[PDB]
Design a protein around this ligand. Structure first.
Ligand SMILES: C[S@@+](CC[C@H](N)C(=O)[O-])C[C@H]1O[C@@H](n2cnc3c(N)ncnc32)[C@H](O)[C@@H]1O
Ligand code: SF4
Ligand SMILES: [Mg+2]
Ligand SMILES: [Mg+2]
Lengths: 126, 400, 38
RNA sequence: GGACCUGGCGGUGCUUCAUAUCCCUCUAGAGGAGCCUGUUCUGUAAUCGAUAAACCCCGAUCAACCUCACCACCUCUUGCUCAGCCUAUAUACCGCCAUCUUAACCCUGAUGAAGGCUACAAAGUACGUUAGGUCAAGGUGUAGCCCAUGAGGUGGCAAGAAAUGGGCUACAUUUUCUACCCCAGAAAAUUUAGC
């Protein structure tokens, strides 16, 4: 009335802060391009950006945690961790589709390594 | 819409265009960069010699930003409606009511806080009042006031400003302020910043309450940045009614150029225009001498504000190096009836000069705003040139 | 390229190709390879 | 009305100390000289203007007959391309800066309000806001003009005063020149920062 009367779960990657990237956390993407003397770092980063967007859009609400984008030679391993909510047939169809799409996208032998988990693996709570 | 392309023409009375260039057209009310009188400037620094160190750097900045961003006190009626909405959505409402609502406090100006105000607003306040007074002097040079009153005379800036313009006719300067510290501070300023001396301006009468006699009417009554200090709309209404009843020729009200300041002055404007006294001692009506070209409701009161800017040279201090600008809202109410029917639009926004065209935001006599893009071929060589030289706060001489 | 060069002869994190804000966002997540903040 | 309990005191003063920010302490400048300059005033019909866009020809540097802006005269148009515009709007939104507001248990008091500690131990343990700035290293829209806010021709536009702020140069005897890279010979008060 009168004026005077008036007067969250987190996974391992989410839980740990960025200053543990080389102490506790790791690197999701692993490529030689960024090393000293190696070239094409920006190209690899652009590929990583698109690849993460396309995985998260091709597996909506399925990925339990972030991908791991490994590259050896011309190979491109997406080691992803997903849930057990979708039917296995849909997972197989999406794996085939995304593998072929990315292999013709980058002209390189892309591959997927889906790892299903029952639910989000919470590390702690913030 | 006071600028119809090809129909509206420049208003040539006194043979303007023939006998004078365009840069001196009668609607030019721009005032050069305001410099305070040396006596006022010298006194302010002398009175501050006790403490002008790094501590005053923060206090002046803190006070200035606080006053600028201060909102009007929240009326209870607005509070209940806000309480109900939070109640429907939901002690908890009170906690949410602490936020989303402005905490308006009285500023109890003691000796310490009166020094901070003087170093923060004496220069700014003087320029704003000087611009408002120049409106009267420029358009009506025959006006020679003999008496003046200032409601809320904090540092005497109004008294100094009036002396600068009407010093050869004013004989009495009635000053009112409830804070005893300001009256002492102002009195020292008029005596060269010394407690013992001779007043620079003669006839000043310092008070703490308004005059009582019904039959005394001061020619010019002024209230600059004072109505925002009152706690409730009831006090604001009573003060303005008292001021208008004692206004002989002109009532000048000035506030900050914010939404809160503009809204306050509009309420005072409609209050005086819509006379309610059944049989006042003074039966003369009232009209808006400036800055409005009409008595109709404001067209920018909905969402925007209407403010004017006056650049001035600040008092030399440890933190006043470059020139500053004073953005303020004003309204002048004059007794009687408008002098003629040829009233001119008012430019209420900075004029943007661009190649071969000029952008002008105008308040028209019809009560509407017109964002007119003036060009030589559409509107004419004379009218385009007049707007090319015009500036914020001027009048555009257009007819029909 | 060749044509313009011939006449002439007679006479922000662009390193990674990222927006400067985005590079911080990526590097904090550990996404960039070997970009450890120190 | 008697006795007692909890208080709050948006408390007020002193006493003792922690007493760091900030002064004092240390170093180097700035007051001189010559230039260019920001601001302010006044002036003209006009603009004092701007060179990822002139001139240069040791270094620099002024107008250049440049050029876009401006003043005064004019001209082109269905034209560039269903044309063209360095127009407006963050007083449209985001982006970014800044303003201001804001648990249980166990004992004691005769089972009263209520209270519960001693270590050589005596009941205690478990977000909003703003006619805000910024569209120069960032974006999404919204409106303007379109025989003119588009395109061109002709000429003209040269500015002065102080008061203040900054920038560029040389400023030496613990110096300068040669040989060397260190044992040689010849010459001649205010106030801003930092640790
Ligand atoms: C800060 S001053 C106004 C600024 C001043 N006019 C200037 O030069 O800028 C406002 C004054 O109004 C005064 N005041 C507040 N309420 C008042 C009232 N009801 N009657 C008279 N004066 C009042 C206060 O004492 C305060 O000093
Ligand atoms: S917008 Fe027009 S009518 Fe409203 S306050 Fe300003 S001048 Fe007056
Ligand atoms: Mg704005
Ligand atoms: Mg010139």
């Amino acid at each position: 009335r009168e004026l005077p009367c008036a007067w969250k779960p987190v996974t391992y990657e989410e839980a740990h802060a960025p200053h543990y990237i080389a102490h506790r956390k790791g690197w999701l993407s692993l490529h030689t391009g960024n090393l000293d003397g190696e070239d094409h770092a920006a190209e690899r980063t652009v590929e990583d950006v698109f690849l993460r967007k396309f995985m998260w859009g091709t597996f909506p609400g399925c990925l339990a945690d972030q991908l791991v984008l490994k590259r050896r030679g011309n190979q491109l391993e997406i080691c992803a961790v997903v849930l057990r909510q979708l039917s296995p047939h849909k997972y197989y169809f999406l794996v085939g589709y995304s593998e072929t799409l990315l292999s013709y996208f980058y002209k390189c032998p892309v591959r997927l390594h889906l790892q299903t988990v029952p639910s989000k693996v919470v590390y702690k709570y913030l | 819409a006071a600028l119809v392309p090809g129909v509206t023409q420049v208003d040539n009375k006194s043979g303007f265009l023939q006998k004078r260039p365009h840069r001196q057209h009668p609607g030019i009310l721009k005032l050069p960069h305001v410099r305070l009188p040396q006596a006022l400037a010298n006194g302010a620094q002398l009175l501050l010699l006790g403490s002008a160190g790094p501590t005053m750097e923060n206090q002046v900045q803190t006070l200035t930003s606080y006053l600028w961003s201060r909102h009007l006190p929240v009326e209870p009626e607005e509070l209940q409606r806000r309480a109900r909405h939070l109640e429907k959505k939901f002690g908890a409402v009170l906690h949410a009511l602490r936020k989303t609502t402005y905490h308006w406090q009285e500023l109890s100006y003691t000796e310490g806080l009166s020094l901070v105000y003087m170093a923060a607003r004496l220069d700014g306040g003087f320029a704003a009042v000087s611009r408002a007074f120049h409106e009267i002097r420029a358009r009506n040079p025959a006006f020679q006031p003999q008496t003046l009153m200032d409601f809320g005379s904090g540092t005497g800036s109004v008294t100094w400003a009036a002396h600068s313009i009407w010093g050869q006719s004013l004989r009495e300067y009635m000053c009112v302020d409830r804070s005893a510290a300001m009256l002492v501070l102002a009195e020292k300023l008029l005596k060269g910043g010394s407690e013992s001396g001779e007043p620079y301006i003669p006839g000043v009468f310092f008070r703490q309450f308004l005059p009582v006699s019904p039959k005394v009417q001061f020619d010019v009554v002024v209230s600059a940045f004072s109505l925002s200090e009152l706690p409730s709309k009831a006090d604001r209404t009573e003060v303005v009614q008292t001021l208008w009843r004692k206004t002989g020729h002109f009532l000048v009200l000035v506030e900050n150029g914010t939404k809160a300041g503009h809204s306050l002055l509009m309420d005072a404007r409609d209050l005086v225009l819509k006379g309610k006294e059944k049989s006042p001692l003074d039966p003369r009506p009232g009209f808006v001498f400036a800055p409005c070209p009409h008595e109709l409701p404001c067209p920018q009161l909905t969402n925007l504000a209407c403010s004017f800017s006056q650049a001035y040279h600040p008092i030399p201090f440890s933190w006043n190096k470059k020139p500053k600008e004073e953005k303020f809202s004003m309204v002048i109410l004059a007794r009687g009836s408008p002098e003629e029917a040829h009233r001119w639009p008012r430019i209420t926004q900075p004029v943007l000069k661009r190649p071969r065209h000029v952008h002008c935001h105008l308040c028209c006599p019809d009560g509407h705003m017109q964002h007119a893009v003036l060009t030589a071929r559409r509107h004419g060589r004379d009218l385009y040139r007049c707007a090319r030289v015009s500036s914020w706060g001027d009048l555009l001489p257009v007819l029909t | 390229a060749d044509e313009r060069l011939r006449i002439n002869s007679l006479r922000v994190k662009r390193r990674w190709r990222l927006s400067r804000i985005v590079f911080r966002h990526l590097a904090d997540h550990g996404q960039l390879s070997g970009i450890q903040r120190a």
